[PDB]
Amino acid sequence: FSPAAP
Amino acid sequence: FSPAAP
Amino acid sequence: FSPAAP
Amino acid sequence: FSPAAP
Amino acid sequence: FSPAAP
Amino acid sequence: FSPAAP
Amino acid sequence: FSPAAP
Amino acid sequence: DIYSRLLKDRIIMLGSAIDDNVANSIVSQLLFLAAEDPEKEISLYINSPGGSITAGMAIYDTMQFIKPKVSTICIGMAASMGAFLLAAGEKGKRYALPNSEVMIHQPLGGAQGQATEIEIAAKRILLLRDKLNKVLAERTGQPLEVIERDTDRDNFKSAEEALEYGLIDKILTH
Amino acid sequence: DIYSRLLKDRIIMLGSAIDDNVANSIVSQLLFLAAEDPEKEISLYINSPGGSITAGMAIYDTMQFIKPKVSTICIGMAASMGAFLLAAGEKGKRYALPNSEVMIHQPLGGAQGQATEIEIAAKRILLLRDKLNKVLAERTGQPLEVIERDTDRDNFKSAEEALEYGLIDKILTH
Amino acid sequence: DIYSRLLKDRIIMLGSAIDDNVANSIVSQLLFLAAEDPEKEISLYINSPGGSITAGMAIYDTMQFIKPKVSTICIGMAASMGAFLLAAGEKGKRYALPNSEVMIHQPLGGAQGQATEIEIAAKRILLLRDKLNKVLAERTGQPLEVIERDTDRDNFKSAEEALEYGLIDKILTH
Amino acid sequence: DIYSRLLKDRIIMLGSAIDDNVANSIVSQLLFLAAEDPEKEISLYINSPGGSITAGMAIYDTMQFIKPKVSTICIGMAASMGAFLLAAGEKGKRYALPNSEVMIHQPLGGAQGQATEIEIAAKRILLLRDKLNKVLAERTGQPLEVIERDTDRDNFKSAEEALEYGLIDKILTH
Amino acid sequence: DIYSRLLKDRIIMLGSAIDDNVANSIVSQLLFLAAEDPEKEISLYINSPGGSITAGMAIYDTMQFIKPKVSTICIGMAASMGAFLLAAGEKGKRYALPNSEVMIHQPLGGAQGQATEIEIAAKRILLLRDKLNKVLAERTGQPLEVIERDTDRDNFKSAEEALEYGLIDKILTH
Amino acid sequence: DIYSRLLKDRIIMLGSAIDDNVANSIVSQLLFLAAEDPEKEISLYINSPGGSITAGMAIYDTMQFIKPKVSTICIGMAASMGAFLLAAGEKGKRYALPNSEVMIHQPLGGAQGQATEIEIAAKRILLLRDKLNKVLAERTGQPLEVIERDTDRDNFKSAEEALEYGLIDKILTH
Amino acid sequence: DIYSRLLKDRIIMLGSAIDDNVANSIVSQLLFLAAEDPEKEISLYINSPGGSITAGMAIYDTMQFIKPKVSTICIGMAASMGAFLLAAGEKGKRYALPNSEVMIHQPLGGAQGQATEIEIAAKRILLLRDKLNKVLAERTGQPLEVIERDTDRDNFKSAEEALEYGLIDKILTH
Secondary structure, X not given: OOXXXX | OOXXXX | OOXXXX | XXXXXX | OXXXXX | OOOOXX | OXXXXX | OHHHHXXXXXXXXXXXXXXXXXXXXXXXXXXXXXXXXXXOOEEEEEEEOOEOHHHHHHHHHHHHHOOOOEEEEEEXXXXXXXXXXXXXXXXXXXXXXXXXXXXXXXXXXXXXOOXXXXXXXXXXXHHHHHHHHHHHHHHHOOOHHHHHXXXXXXXXXXXXXXXXXXXXXXXXXX | OHHHHHHOOOEEEEOOOEOHHHXXXXXXXXXXXXXXXXXXXXXXXXXXXXXXXXXXXXXXXXXXXXXXXXXXXXXXXXXXXXXXXXXXXOOOOEEEOOOOEEEEOOOOOOXXXXXXXXXXXXXXXXXXXXXXXXXXXXXXXXXXXXXXXXXXXXXXXXXXXXXXXXXOOEEOOO | OHHHHHHHOOEEEEOOOEOHHHHHHHHHHHHHHHHHOOOOOEEEEEEEOOEOHHHHHHHHHHHHHOOOOEXXXXXXXXXXXXXXXXXXXXXXXXXXXXXXXXXXXXXXXXXXXXXXXXXXXXXXXXXXHHHHHHHHHHHHOOOHHHHHHHOOOOEEEEHHHHHHHOOOOEEOOO | OHHHHHHHOOEEEEOOOEOXXXXXXXXXXXXXXXXXXXXXXXXXXXXXXXXXXXXXXXXXXXXXXXXXXXXEEEEEXXXXXXXXXXXXXXXXXEEEOOOOEEEEOOOOOOOOOOHHHHHHHHHHHHHHHHHHHHHHHHHHOOOHHHHHHHOXXXXXXXXXXXXXXXXXXXXXXX | OHHHHHHHOOXXXXXXXXXXXXXXXXXXXXXXXXXXXXXXXXXXXXXXOOEOHHHHHXXXXXXXXXXXXXXXXXXXXXXXXXXXXXXXXXXXXXXXXOOOEEEEOOOOOOOOOOHHHHHHHHHHHHHHHHHHXXXXXXXXXXXXXXXXXXXXXXXXXXXXXXXHHOOOOEEOOO | OHHHHHHHOOEEEEOOOEOHHHHHHHHHHXXXXXXXXXXXXXXXXXXXXXEOHHHHHHHHHXXXXXXXOEEEEEEEEEEOHHHHHHHOOOOOOEEEOOOOEEEEOOOOOOOOOOHHHHHHXXXXXXXXXXXXXXXXXXXXOOOHHHHHXXXXXXXXXXXXXXXXXXXXXXXXXX | OHHHXXXXXXXXXXXXXXXXXXXXXXXXXXXXXXXXXXOOOEEXXXXXXXEOHHHHHHHHHHHHHOOOOEEEEEEEEEEOHHHHXXXXXXXXXXXXXXXXXXXXXXXXXXXXXXXXXXXXXXXXXXXXXXXXXXXXXXXXXXXXXXXXXXXXXXEEEEHHHHHHHOOOOEEOOO
């Protein structure tokens, strides 16, 4: 789950 | 299952 | 089971 | 089991 | 868990 | 278990 | 557990 | 496995009661083989007492969707939805071994609760019965009225009778 | 595995009741495929009786979060949260096989203890219901109060009715 | 695996009660071996208490369909459908070890419900019995009514009596 | 493995109830990733209904011990110690999906035996609640008396309420 | 595996209650080893409380059938059918450890139902007892009347007693 | 797996109730690591509710027998024999996480039968307590009378309390 | 595996209740190591509550038969037959850790049925008790009269007491 976790 | 999912 | 399924 | 099955 | 175990 | 079985 | 078992 | 070897030859094994696990497995295999070669026919060997109507329809719908014609072979027993899938095989490509058995009847189910709830379960199972019987009449060439009367109670048939009824096309022998 | 083979074609299989384990697995596949190629569409095959609301929402939120458009296909049966996820597929890319079934109803739960505790549980499930219904409303075009009325009791729909309702966009006929 | 080692020598092991799974496995091994070489004989070793009639018939029918001749050997005990398959081996190639046992009896089953339903179950098990008995008759040289009389109750036979009855052709000394 | 591939990207999945086995697994993963790179950030995905307080604290302490900052993401549900861990993520790096749910409350437990034994268990669980509430107060910025009143009974919050409350820093969307 | 290595040295381990599965496994190993080298002797180590008579006879008949001479070694305890197989080892090659036990008794069984059915089961078990006793007499050298009275009840013998009775030929010491 | 990694770094995980199985596993690991490198210290991580006294003592005696110094780390909870082992770590190398707990109490057991049999059991467990209490006194620096009185009932201590008691030497902060 | 690594060092682990499976496994390892090198000593680590007398004697007889001298080490507990085996270790090579426990008592059994059947069982267990006591007296140097007396009821001994009694030869301290 990126941006931002990764 | 294509056409169209793939 | 051939002839004919295959 | 041969002679004769094999 | 180092420093210091290892 | 030898001598003698093997 | 050596000396002496091994 | 021994089945992985059969899959290579485009043979799908339906040898157990039909539930969602089995249905999904069969659906995947069907898509896989159709993908590997949408031309070569696929063989579905059936030895099953049947099972879930929806799980069964999932297999049925997939067989209809794929380009490859799907032959069906009844080995041992094809009952309920298993018999439905057998009769759904490519017309002319439906087989059964000599001492195979085929059984057709009506859907089974349950309903517990308020009158309104029972009614909901009843309306659904009746719609399913009609849906399945309609297809069975098309596949066997039997008039709907006959399918309805003949599936009232468990109706067991030998390979011979299944052929006469229009559930299969040929009986394997040698 | 055959499923791992489907994953390579960006097909995720939801073929069982939904619990945290199934949810965590599907969420993982969605993130994986999104990383493999954030452009390529993803196909979510659904044949489940539904399950946990929170587990279902975890899947829903992940589908929405990722870049790839997620197509949904109803195979056999998409009930409760399974139907919710079917209706959550990319607009225009929500499908159903000809004899598939779609069923929507209200959340189920339980409460035991003091009036206060029962109230807390009651408030939560009614809140979960509104949350789900608002999404279904948005997804189908039906206003919230209609979704509410129609899900009061188990509501089973054919592929045709599901299309007419706005749950799916097209039926994979022939 | 030892069984895989024996399968290489075209030896199939039927060493358990017979159900659909066992049946589908044996059917597969037969089709497999028959593919590897339709000329070389196949040996079916039997130590089984029997089991499902339809599962057994699936095995019988496959044995009959394939070109390779199937020899059978009774090891320990061949009872009921296990005894049926022993008697189904190629004429002249049905064997039994010196202290093996062979037991034949009638089909077993049940039924609960309305008179009409009990009747359907009754007619079916009596038909299966006739079907199995006619095959045993042909295989042993005994007339149908003798097979029927002799299977009324559990009928245990030594290797010598099995030979005399026509269930096997030879007893393997050493 | 899918999770092994996620761990490669420094993602740890807490997708079940927390017991000693789960805690020991997550603790190890946190130490492993911290070893691989003490600078690289770590992500803890949470879809759990909570569980053992000591097991949860073991994860908490590990998160505080390692150099890498640990962000947290609530997927589906983060309840009880799951919520505690969510709120324990690096300040500014605590996330929640749009429809995620967070729930906080007081510790649950039991006490059986003589008056004095029950007193031992009571004093212990009351100390744990104090210890847990003080941390929550620090993590959310809420005064302790608010945390005490708010955790008296099951307190379920939406992603929006959790953000407002100070349990998370941001809600992910697309 | 620790047993695969033993098999490599032509040692078969019968160390559990005898049932069809165990019997089939032992029979397979005997055939395998006899195939590998029909001249090299085989050793059957026995620590079994016994079991099925038909399964045990399956093992007995295979031991007599193959060309290799099968020596037997009693380890711990050889009771009932296990003692039967111990006594069936090649004369002069039946061994026992100093403190191992050998026990012989009569066949155990059951029968429930109509008088006629109880009669059939009775006649069978009595026949099995006669068959097993006749072999024990032949193998030990004892008269049949002696074997008959001595197996009336559980008859436990020491290695020395077993030797003096004729069940074994030698006791392993150093 | 994850623990194999830990073992390579000379970290042994005691993360479950202690039974002979677990005990034998940890003893093996200590002996292995000691053989691998008798100079490098070993780390025993502990998150256990304790267990069998004799199994705990096997671990304990091995820690002391081997050349490598064994550090102990309390994670989550170290109760009963788990606390005993924690306290047996090399002096100055006994650690605990900030929020972990340590609980000490007396041996638990049972006894049924004749007075003299109950007496045998009573004497053994009382001797066990004295033995464990004497080691705890020696390990903590506390007088024996203090240990005896403090272990009368379940005695829960925080990491800080355990340190000030002499059960550990340092708290792992960050 | 970790135990496999120890086997290479000629160490055998008897860490559970002694049953036929465990006995056959231990017997296997003994014969294996003896083959590897009939001169190099073997180590048997014991942490067991005991079990089957026959299973234990099989282990015992194998220890006596092989050329490699087998040393024994009590870790945690060596009760009943486990203690028997400990004492059966090569004179001068029987050990025990500082806090290990050793227990000796008399055989445990059961007897059901007719007076005559209870007599059979009783006679057998009494013979066993005498057989075991006789060996225990020889291994320890204790007169038979003392062993019989000292084993009447559960007799728990410390390592020091085991030493003075003659059950072991040395205590592994440092």
